[PDB]
């Protein structure tokens, strides 16, 4: 809430989960998946108790996905279906979540880096015409990940459902010539976990069953510190084998599919991706930077997003970096490794740091006028209102 | 045949052929592709590695590795395959019979020259060899002894002034900014339209786009507003799968990095100031001779509008009295090889070689004395 009483809202508008809330909030108000589901008839399922609308959204769709044909509007940070994306924004601003009046509120949004421009122009075109938000801002996911951590200098690693991007900053000075994107995230893992479960005979071909495997991933799958030690456990023992019960009562068993699926963040060739993993990419992004800045990046590696919540990811990441520092910088001097100072900020609240940072920048700039972008400015200028941010559009 | 051989060994291409000839016999990219899958179809010429145009034909299933980067050789094992592919397969000659003339950019590490000369003898058993500067050969083909050359290739860009066959090494300047740095920048701005190119093979596609649609703007800020108003520069390109793209503003923003490297984050100065600052380091007497005999070389200088933008910027810095004349022949993509066939065809050059016996007694360090 600003001086004028207008509520200041922060919506992440992610690719797999929406994180909406108000400024100054230390948690988010609602966290729900970004899917839209239309009704469908299937012979296996029989339900006539709960009313199924023609357009279900969010948590009331994923819960009832058995009777639905869900579809994600966003993919890899980019918006595909606008007519399904507006039905999501409505649910986000309606009596079921944040029962606000858009005409008397300020909004803060996020876009990932090196995305197209028409995806940013078309969002702002929508917030001022359809919802007629009073003040709008489109922030950078990296800079917000630092505000929550309380920093001015740190290489960011933000992995979500569709996008995995890396953005270095040094004392608040953006270095977009070092920004890198890996094309791997929680959705490219969820597909690889289906392709692995297919060897056991479990088939998850439908659109609803895609979420069911996400829950199987969020619960069981993890990252191996030393992948050789994990393979001995799967060959010599059978303790990794867990069990998951599905909504239809059928039980399954998941073993070495727990560390093999998310290893595609470090060995990405397993999903037909040419390149290097998140560690050898983060080390090569730093080695591109100016030589004086490198020392403070290793000390301030910041994680974020929900694809960094695999058990063992930061420890695995610290390991692979020191192997590369030893191999390429120190040329094999183990004795000097003790002096190598590296700290990977892995706070367990790293699941929502892009939102928390948006609560922080909003509360700091809620009561300023040169910051936001007004409806009046969009009526006069149009999409050229974005020049306030430095985004060259006409 | 006792004709000498010539090999450029640029960062991106390998230009080869015989001495005395007017154009090279073999031109292929300096890449070595290794497959990224497991070949289960047996008896199908499935080799462990591919080289040259045989890789670009199979780029879909390969990881293309440029063994050279900014002029330096990073992988010597792969570079033997390049030379081995040059002699035995392309030129179809043994190297022990003929000599070879190699090239190299200035201000490179000495270990790069030491290794080449070591490889031509101990591996290929050449009778002799020689290592020339790339810019100096461009002037031989130009038919001059006075002029400043600006060779801009795939990885390196360097200036070399000469005055009556007397090179001024104190004025030589190098700039690690070239086509491969532009190709990568083009892939970063093409995301703005919605076109994603990440794979190495996709990097070669973007190379073909860069060398077909990108031009230099005589006034960057003026054409910036042209595209914002109209749709005249919007050219299109057909990908091999049949898809189609369109690029406007991105045609002249890519080569402008040569004149504004701040887009790439580099603190360095543009080529228009580099070649000027080099001239200012020469003697006050000979500056006028170099303002006139200003030559360009390398494939990167094949953009349309590059000669007019250099002439414009150089005039703006230098005094109005001096007349700026740019020289841009229509074969400047092979000038460095053309001069090599010239320089090896001379009687005076037959003593500048480094014979087998001379390397046997002095070792590979003789290259620093013999080859300037």
């Amino acid at each position: 809430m600003d001086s004028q009483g207008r509520k200041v809202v922060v919506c992440d508008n992610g690719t797999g989960f929406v994180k909406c809330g108000y400024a100054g909030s230390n948690f988010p108000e609602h966290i729900f998946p970004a899917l839209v589901g239309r009704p469908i008839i299937r012979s296996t399922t029989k339900v006539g108790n709960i009313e199924i609308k023609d357009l279900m959204v969010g948590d009331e769709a994923s819960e009832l996905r058995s009777m639905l044909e869900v579809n994600y509007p966003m993919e890899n940070g980019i918006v595909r279906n606008w007519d399904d994306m507006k039905h999501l924004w409505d649910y986000t601003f309606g009596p079921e979540k944040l029962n606000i009046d858009t005409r008397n509120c300020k909004i803060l949004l996020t876009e990932p880096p090196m995305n197209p421009t028409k995806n940013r122009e078309k969002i702002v075109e929508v917030m001022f015409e359809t919802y007629q938000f009073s003040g709008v801002y489109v922030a950078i996911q990296a800079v917000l990940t630092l505000y929550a951590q309380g920093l001015l200098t740190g290489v960011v690693v933000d992995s979500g459902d569709g996008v995995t991007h890396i953005c270095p900053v040094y004392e608040g000075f953006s270095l977009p010539h070092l920004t890198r994107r890996l094309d791997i995230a929680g959705r490219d893992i969820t597909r690889y976990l289906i392709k692995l479960l297919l060897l056991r005979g479990y088939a998850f071909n439908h659109s609803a069953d895609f979420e069911t495997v996400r829950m199987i991933k969020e619960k069981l799958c993890y990252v191996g510190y030393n992948i050789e030690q994990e393979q001995k456990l799967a060959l010599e023992t059978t303790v990794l084998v867990e069990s998951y019960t599905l909504p239809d009562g059928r039980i399954i068993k998941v073993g070495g599919e727990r560390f093999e699926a998310p290893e595609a963040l470090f060995q990405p060739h397993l999903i037909n991706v040419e390149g290097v993993g998140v560690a050898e990419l983060l080390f090569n992004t730093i080695q591109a930077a100016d030589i004086d800045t490198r020392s403070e990046f290793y000390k301030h590696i910041v994680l974020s997003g929900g694809s960094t919540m695999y058990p063992g990811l930061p420890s695995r990441l610290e390991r692979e970096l020191k192997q590369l520092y030893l191999e390429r910088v120190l040329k094999g001097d183990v004795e000097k490794l003790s002096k190598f100072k590296i700290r990977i900020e892995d706070p367990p609240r790293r699941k929502h740091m892009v939102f928390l940072g948006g609560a922080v920048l909003a509360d700091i700039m809620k009561d300023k006028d040169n910051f936001w972008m007004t409806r009046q400015e969009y009526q006069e200028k149009g999409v050229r209102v974005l020049e306030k941010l430095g985004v060259t559009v006409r | 045949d006792i004709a000498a051989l010539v090999v450029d060994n640029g960062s991106g291409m390998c230009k080869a052929g015989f001495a005395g000839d007017d154009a090279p016999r073999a031109v292929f990219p300096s890449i070595v592709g290794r497959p990224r899958h497991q070949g289960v179809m047996v008896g199908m010429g499935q080799k462990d590695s591919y080289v040259g145009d045989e890789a670009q034909s199979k780029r879909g299933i390969l990881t293309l590795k440029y063994p050279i980067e900014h002029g330096i050789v990073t992988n010597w094992d792969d570079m033997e395959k390049i030379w081995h592919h040059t002699f035995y397969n392309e030129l179809r000659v043994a190297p022990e019979e003929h000599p070879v003339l190699l090239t190299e950019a200035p201000l490179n590490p000495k270990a790069n020259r030491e290794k080449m000369t070591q490889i031509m003898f101990e591996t290929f058993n050449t009778p002799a060899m020689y290592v020339a500067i790339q810019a100096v050969l461009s002037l031989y083909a130009s038919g001059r002894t006075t002029g400043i050359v600006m060779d801009s290739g795939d990885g390196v860009t360097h200036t070399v002034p000469i005055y009556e066959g007397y090179a001024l090494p104190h004025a030589i300047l190098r700039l690690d900014l070239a086509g491969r740095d532009l190709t990568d920048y083009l892939m970063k701005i093409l995301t703005e339209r919605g076109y994603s190119f990440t794979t190495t093979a996709e990097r070669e596609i973007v190379r073909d786009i860069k060398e077909k649609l990108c031009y230099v703007a005589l006034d960057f800020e003026q054409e910036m507003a042209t595209a914002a108003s109209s749709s005249s520069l919007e050219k299109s390109y057909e990908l091999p799968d049949g898809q189609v793209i369109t690029i406007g503003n991105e045609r002249f923003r890519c080569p402008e990095a040569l004149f504004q490297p701040s887009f790439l984050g580099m603190e360095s100065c543009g080529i228009h100031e580099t070649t000027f600052n080099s001239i200012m380091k020469c003697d006050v007497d000979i500056r006028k001779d170099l303002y006139a005999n200003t030559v360009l070389s390398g494939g990167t200088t094949m953009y349309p509008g590059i000669a007019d933008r250099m002439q414009k910027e150089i005039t703006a810095l230098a005094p109005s009295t001096m007349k700026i004349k740019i020289i841009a022949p229509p074969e400047r993509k092979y000038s460095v090889w053309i001069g090599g066939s010239i320089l090896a065809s001379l009687s005076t050059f037959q003593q500048m070689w480094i014979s087998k016996q001379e390397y046997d007694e002095s070792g590979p360090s003789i290259v620093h004395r013999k080859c300037f």
Partner: peptide
């Protein structure tokens, strides 16, 4: 995306 990748 429009060219390259889906989005």
């Amino acid at each position: 995306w429009x060219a390259x990748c889906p989005a």
